[PDB]
């Protein structure tokens, strides 16, 4: 079905506030969106087409097996370009003259931040945005009451298509925890038998086999249990992210984490690759389920990228249902305190210089060149509840000058990851290579202004719980249609209770939200964590079938999968805006639901933009 009952408001002041208040909010909202659009364009990241169309009216200028063979000889040739990091950003040179890439200006970024920082504490704008957010919830409630039967009928009438055969993407999941506890326990106990003489660990210079590792712990294969591994988050982990980090060590053993959960170890990440490929097998068996695993590049060593690429190539860690995102833990303070890094610039060099070198000279890093074909972007992870005592501004030390053992704040990490990524994408675009996106963890806990940083620089975010405390930011995320990969089960076990999770309000109000498992090892109990994640949410918040499919469609849209794959998944016209881009035959989402979302977004954007043009100045 396509036609549906529509809610309309008649009379003057349709927004419920006097025009003077509306104009003030509109000016700030439009300016904020322009700021985000600028940096998305700068970094070659996506910006909502619907938002861009409405903003163009007020815009001065126009807007907008693979690893079987690894032969460097057939790879693209060397461009001979020189590389050097200047003030925390990689610069490209002809060999010599600087290549005119749009190198970000820090002062411009700081000025933009200050505008948003003042905006998020603007009282009058806060009330206006909160009123609009309540309006969106009220309108959606009316839409459901007057059209859910019609929406259900459309789902019923579609042939062949149901929730079990629509595409679903685990938009936010970590490789180190992609397996369930029982799966990990079985894999370890199988490994204790198959190969028995291989040296798997060196303890104080003493080479040890896996059996000798377990005998040192006074543990037998029979004695091992899920409780023994102790890798599951419990109620005592709540508000204790440090205790959650400890769950990554089985049996409280860093050696077991090294052997089975690390890509780089004495076994060349043999066990970790095998477990991932087993997870890949389950994903391929399910056909319709996909995941975007997070692999760790710590930036501690210059060789991490090459070793990670070789690890994937040698073990053939690849699947059509898996896309890779590289996460950078914010652990500079730990590294600096141990003397393993000289300055924050060295950490940035270990993260981006190998990438820049691979682009200019693919044969220089042949394994990395192949691996990057499946790497979509960067992620930033750390205990986001930790306080920040340093404000990122022009007075902050540059990365080369940052030699103290203090961890730079969240915005410091994000800006330099963004700045280097933006230049890298420009270089890779010129050669026709795949570009990257920035998809950080944001809003889970800690200062609200972390969401200001992501709004400026992030393609999409994960968690985003604190948007409920910032009406203007939540309103902007809706207007910009910024994807949010949420993990209610993870939040329930760490920060925010399930019944208080803001996901229901985000979904009702039209934010592009998707469901994710985060760390199935520490949380889920079934053999299909993503289905279990969908189950709990659908029951506790009593989500309708249309709501479930809408979440699945959102997960695909915010994923890093290629256009060709998405064309098969959602249809060749999926890139179109509104109902035109939706095919119920492939998504099981009625056009009535998509139509309502598109009209609601268009109405909201029209309200803000038309208010700006309606201002009358007096000489």
Ligand X SMILES: Nc1ncnc2c1ncn2[C@@H]1O[C@H](COP(=O)(O)O)[C@@H](O)[C@H]1O
- In the three-class reduction of DSSP (H, G, I as helix; E, B as strand; rest coil), residue 444 is classed as coil
- If binding is defined by CB under 6 A, does position 381 make contact with ligand X? yes
**Structure-token pair, residue 553:** 């469609």
Q: How many residues form the binding site for its own copies (CB under 8 A)?
A: 94
Helices (H) and strands (E) in the chain, counts: 25, 13
DSSP letters for 354-399: HHHHHHH-GGGSHHHHHHGGGEEEEEEES-TTS------STTSPPT
Whether residue 224 contacts residue 247, with contact meaning beta carbons closer than 8 Å, is answered with no
Q: 526 or 562, CB closer to its own copies?
A: 526
Closest CA relative to residue 140, chosen from 618, 608, 479, 601: 601
Question: Is 247 marked as binding a ligand?
Answer: yes
The residues annotated as belonging to the active site are 463
| Cβ at position 519, least distance to ligand X in Å | 6
Helix boundaries (H) for 158-195? 181-194
The DSSP element (H or E) to which 513 belongs, if any, is strand 513-515
d(CA 132, CA 109): 29
Q: Which does 74 bind (CB under 5 to 8 A by kind): its own copies, Zn ion, ligand X, none?
A: none
Contact pick of 176, 350, 425, 493 for ligand X (by CB under 6 A): 176
- In the three-class reduction of DSSP (H, G, I as helix; E, B as strand; rest coil), residue 88 is classed as coil
Q: 428 or 463, CB closer to ligand X?
A: 463
- 174 strand-pairing partners: 294
Contact pick of 304, 505, 518, 532 for Zn ion (by CB under 5 A): 518
Q: Which does 435 bind (CB under 5 to 8 A by kind): Zn ion, its own copies, ligand X, none?
A: none
- If binding is defined by CB under 6 A, does position 331 make contact with ligand X? yes
Contact pick of 59, 142, 199, 606 for its own copies (by CB under 8 A): 142
Question: Is 54 marked as binding a ligand?
Answer: no
Q: 295 or 486, CB closer to its own copies?
A: 486
Q: Which residues ranging from 255 to 274 are in contact with ligand X (CB under 6 A)?
A: 262
Contact pick of 84, 206, 239, 429 for its own copies (by CB under 8 A): 239
How far apart are the two ends of the chain, measured CA to CA in Å? 53
Whether residue 127 contacts residue 133, with contact meaning beta carbons closer than 8 Å, is answered with no
Q: 177 or 321, CB closer to ligand X?
A: 177
Contact pick of 147, 171, 265, 296 for ligand X (by CB under 6 A): 296
Q: 214 or 272, CB closer to ligand X?
A: 272
**Structure-token pair, residue 388:** 């920040």
Q: 265 or 609, CB closer to ligand X?
A: 265
- If binding is defined by CB under 8 A, does position 387 make contact with its own copies? yes
Q: Which residues ranging from 505 to 544 are in contact with ligand X (CB under 6 A)?
A: 519
d(CA 303, CA 565): 32
Owner of token pair 């040698």: 314
Contact pick of 104, 329, 483, 520 for ligand X (by CB under 6 A): 329
- If binding is defined by CB under 8 A, does position 162 make contact with its own copies? yes
d(CA 552, CA 549): 5
- If binding is defined by CB under 5 A, does position 112 make contact with Zn ion? no
What does DSSP assign to residue 583? -
Q: How many residues form the binding site for ligand X (CB under 6 A)?
A: 11
Q: Which does 134 bind (CB under 5 to 8 A by kind): its own copies, ligand X, Zn ion, none?
A: its own copies
Which residue positions form the known binding site? Answer: 172, 174, 243-248, 441, 444, 518-522
Which residue positions form the known binding site for substrate? Answer: 174, 243-248, 444, 519-522
């Amino acid at each position: 079905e396509r036609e549906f009952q529509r809610v309309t408001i008649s009379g003057e002041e349709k927004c419920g506030v006097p025009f003077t208040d509306l104009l003030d909010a509109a000016k700030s909202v439009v300016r904020a969106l322009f700021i985000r659009e600028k940096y998305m364009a700068l970094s070659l990241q996506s910006f909502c087409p619907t938002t861009r169309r409405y903003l163009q009216q007020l815009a001065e200028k126009p807007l907008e097996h693979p690893y079987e063979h690894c032969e460097p000889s057939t790879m693209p040739g060397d461009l001979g370009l020189g590389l050097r990091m200047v003030r925390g950003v990689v610069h490209v040179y002809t060999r010599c003259s600087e290549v005119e890439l749009p190198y970000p200006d820090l002062q411009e970024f700081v000025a933009d931040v200050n505008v948003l920082m003042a905006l998020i504490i603007n009282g009058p704008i806060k009330s206006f945005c909160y009123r609009r957010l309540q309006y969106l919830s009220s309108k959606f409630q009316m839409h459901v009451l007057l059209n859910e039967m019609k929406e259900l009928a459309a789902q019923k009438k579609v042939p062949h298509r149901d929730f079990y055969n629509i595409r679903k993407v685990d938009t936010h999941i970590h490789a180190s925890s992609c397996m369930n506890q029982k799966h990990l326990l079985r894999f370890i106990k199988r490994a204790m038998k198959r190969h028995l003489e291989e040296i798997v660990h060196v303890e104080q210079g003493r080479e040890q086999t896996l059996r000798e590792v377990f005998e040192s712990m006074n543990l037998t294969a029979y004695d091992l249990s899920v409780d023994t591994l102790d890798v599951h988050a419990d109620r005592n982990t709540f508000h204790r992210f440090d205790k959650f980090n400890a769950k990554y060590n089985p049996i409280g053993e860093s050696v077991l984490r090294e052997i089975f959960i690390k890509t780089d170890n004495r076994v060349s990440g043999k066990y970790f690759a095998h477990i991932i490929k087993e997870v890949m097998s389950d994903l391929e068996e399910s056909k319709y389920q996909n995941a975007e695993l997070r692999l760790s590049i710590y930036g501690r060593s210059r060789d991490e990228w090459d070793k990670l690429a070789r690890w994937a190539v040698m073990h053939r860690v690849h699947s059509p249902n898996v896309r890779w995102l590289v996460q950078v833990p914010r652990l500079f303070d730990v590294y600096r305190t141990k003397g393993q890094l000289a300055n924050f610039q060295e950490m940035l060099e270990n993260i981006f210089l190998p990438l820049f070198e691979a682009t200019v000279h693919p044969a220089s890093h042949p394994e990395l060149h192949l691996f990057l074909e499946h790497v979509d972007g960067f992620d930033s992870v750390d205990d986001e509840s930790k306080p920040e005592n340093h404000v990122f501004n022009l007075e902050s030390p540059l990365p080369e000058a940052w030699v103290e053992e203090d961890n730079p704040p969240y915005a410091y990490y994000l800006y330099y990851t963004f700045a280097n990524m933006a230049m890298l994408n420009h270089l890779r675009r010129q050669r026709g290579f795949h570009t990257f996106v920035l998809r950080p963890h944001c809003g889970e806990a800690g200062p609200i202004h972390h969401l200001v940083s992501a709004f400026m620089l992030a393609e999409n975010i994960s968690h985003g719980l604190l948007l409920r405390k910032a009406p203007v930011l939540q309103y902007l995320y809706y207007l910009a249609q910024i994807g949010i990969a949420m993990s209610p089960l993870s939040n329930n076990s760490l920060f925010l209770s399930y019944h208080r999770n803001p996901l229901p309000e985000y979904l009702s109000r039209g934010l592009m939200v998707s469901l994710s498992t985060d760390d199935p090892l520490q949380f889920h109990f079934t053999k299909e964590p993503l289905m279990e994640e969908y189950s709990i949410a659908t029951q506790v918040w009593k989500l309708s079938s249309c709501d479930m499919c809408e979440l699945a469609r959102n997960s695909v849209l915010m994923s890093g999968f290629s256009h060709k794959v998405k064309s098969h998944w959602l249809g060749p016209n999926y890139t179109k805006e509104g109902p035109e881009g939706n095919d119920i035959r492939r998504t099981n989402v009625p056009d009535i639901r998509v139509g309502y979302r598109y009209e609601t977004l268009c109405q909201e954007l029209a309200l803000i933009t038309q208010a700006v043009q309606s201002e009358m100045l007096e000489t």
